[PDB]
């Protein structure tokens, strides 16, 4: 007649408490939901105790403490706030995930996707997809320090920090440019990595820099390694006259951390950006290395007048529908103001989101005239296909 | 030489923006002394030449009274008569 088992805490429940316990009799002790068997400092999956003839149970009853879900999982480019008590990750504890605005935004489906609670199973879970944490997607356009639209005659072309947080600098075969897409992809021109006239053996080196406006600070910030190159098959190096398909994507080995000086740019959707008269900003680190970044505002013109000028200047010409010209002959500055293989940034006043409409492609005539770019809107599908790989 | 070209190009771009109905010509005639100072220091003029540049700016905005798309074309002309680019590097 060993004594009746007595629960130490309140959550310990003895399964089928017999009125009396004799020799070779046993009792099993479980715990309520959200609580776990302990017994000392360790943890037990099950507890049973029996009588050793001398009225003594062979083992003492456990304690049944609360379950601890542990430290919440780290949200990439985000964090969490203790909705309940801080430091208490035990049962019935709620946290609120949040993303690093404005550079990142949480994926949607509102006080329902960022809230995660500690369940009785011992893990942080949410009502929709409990095991996995949310994901903070990068915000494409919306630069945090946009260029002033109140343009004046006295206007220095030197760009300030945060104006074009997507500009990149490449020193592959020469000084070239591009734009940042996401936190891992770089959109650039194809002829920047494949020489037109040189060709033949490639003095491979690459090197990609981004994050600042001064060249020396760009170099100091660090060299970003590339892991995959995707060139459009329409581009051909031997055809020095042609520049069709002058577009390429580079994949960084490690994703960058978006900040106020480093933000990507959205891709076009409707064609209203290529309408005549649209003012697009083209940035570049100047030629004849020149230090800081310099921008220039150019208007997109009628392709027919550009073709007339082309064939009137006894040029072979390689214009197509996937291209659009910009600038005006009355502009006394050189047609190479689209320095490097950068982008033709146009701001959409309907959504106030900057979008890359063209890529600096070919400009045969480093003196005066029009500039030529490649319509990004036509190659959007190929860009997305290469990105989803 | 490059200063005159940059100013002429900015004037032509403002003329195009006026022809598109996005920048009203009368709104352009307003600018505070703080804005003039910040522009002069961002372009890189001497701290002493800022007074001459401000005088030139005020006088040139004054002399041009035609409220049309050619205003930006005429103001530029005035900036060349007062030789403002000599206060720039």
Residue numbers in the entry:
A (entry chain C): 308 to 416, 421 to 600, 604 to 703
B (entry chain A): 24 to 112
Text lifted from the article:
Whereas previous studies on salivary gland extracts from the sandfly Lutzomyia longipalpis identified SALO (salivary anticomplement from L. longipalpis) as a potent inhibitor of the classical complement pathway (CP), its precise mechanism of action has remained elusive. We found that SALO inhibits the CP by binding specifically to the zymogen form of C1r. We provide two crystal structure determinations and supporting functional studies which show that SALO binds tightly to the zymogen activation loop of C1r preventing cleavage of its scissile bond. However, since the C1r zymogen undergoes autoactivation over time, we expressed an engineered fragment of human C1r consisting of its two CCP repeats and its serine protease domain, wherein the catalytic serine (S654) had been mutated to alanine (zC1r-12SP).
Thereafter, we crystallized eSALO-WT bound to zC1r-12SP, collected X-ray diffraction data extending to 3.3 Å limiting resolution, and solved the structure by molecular replacement. The asymmetric unit of the crystal contained two copies of the eSALO-WT–zCr-12SP complex, which superimposed well upon each other (RMSD = 0.34 Å across 444 equivalent Cα positions); thus, our subsequent analyses focused on the eSALO-WT–zC1r-12SP complex represented by chains A and C. Whereas the eSALO-WT–zC1r-12SP interaction buried ∼1100 Å2 of surface area at the interface, the most extensive interactions between the two proteins were centered upon the zymogen activation loop of zC1r-12SP. By contrast, there were no contacts between eSALO-WT and either of the CCP domains of the protease, which may be less accessible within the context of the larger C1 structure. Consistent with this, EBI-PISA identified 13 likely hydrogen bonds and four candidate salt bridges between the residues lining this channel, including N33 and Y/X51 (explained further in the following subsection), and residues from the zymogen activation loop of zC1r-12SP, which is composed roughly of residues V458-Q468 inclusive. At the periphery of the eSALO-WT channel, the side chain of E58 formed a salt bridge with the side chain of R461 from zC1r-12SP. Finally, outside the concave channel, residues on the first α helix of eSALO-WT, including D32, appeared to contact a secondary site on zC1r-12SP, which is composed of residues H642–Q647 inclusive. During the course of model building and refinement, we noticed a strong, positive feature in the Fo–Fc electron density map distal to the hydroxyl group of eSALO-WT residue Y51. Based on the geometry of this electron density, we suspected that Y51 had undergone post-translational sulfation during eSALO-WT expression and secretion from HEK293(T) cells. Therefore, we subsequently modeled this residue as sulfotyrosine, X51. In the final model, this sulfate group formed three different hydrogen bonds ranging from 2.6 to 3.2 Å in length with groups derived from R463 and I464, which are the two residues linked by the scissile bond in the C1r zymogen.
